[PDB]
Amino acid sequence: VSALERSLRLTFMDELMERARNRDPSGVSEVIYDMIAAGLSPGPRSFHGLVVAHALNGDEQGAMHSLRKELGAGQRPLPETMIALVRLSGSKGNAQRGLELLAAMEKLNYDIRQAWLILVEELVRTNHLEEANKVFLKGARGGMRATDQLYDLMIEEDCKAGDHSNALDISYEMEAAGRFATTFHFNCLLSVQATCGIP
């Protein structure tokens, strides 16, 4: 890399990252074609700015299309780039797409534990508790150990919704991982058991 190439990349990436943060996917596309005109090859961090710009404007189809451009260009997406797509999929309740992207991260040899945690909290936050349980159990049964805060979140939200079957499944997996249930978790299950008519 020469000094001239480094100087141009800095000013090209200054403009690109200032439009991704501006929530302007169209402008981030113009700079990439400016890079192509100058002969610079867009790397993983240039397509990250394109994914993020679409993702920030709640655009799942454009962000997925941007990822296809990155893979089609032969570039390797950054672990943060996949996390932006996974978190976006959860915000729209698209658990199938979120699980497809997690499979890609494993294929790319990344560490999917952090991205799996993010996917579950997004589904819970956006009132997709049924989808969140399906994703959480697949990760928990697959061997991943969730965070203590997410364990307390899943048990409590299921018991507030009258879903004892999911809350008992998770608490069994929580102890198998190595986190023993406390009075708080038992009080969540009891809140539903006390209304079943069988003391």
């Binding site: 000013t11 090209f12 403009e15 113009e30 700079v31 074609y33 400016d34 005109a37 100058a38």
Partner: peptide, 11 residues
């Protein structure tokens, strides 16, 4: 033709 602040190109 492209004429912006970054690149002036002819293809």
């Amino acid at each position: 033709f492209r004429k912006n602040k970054l690149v002036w190109s002819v293809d």
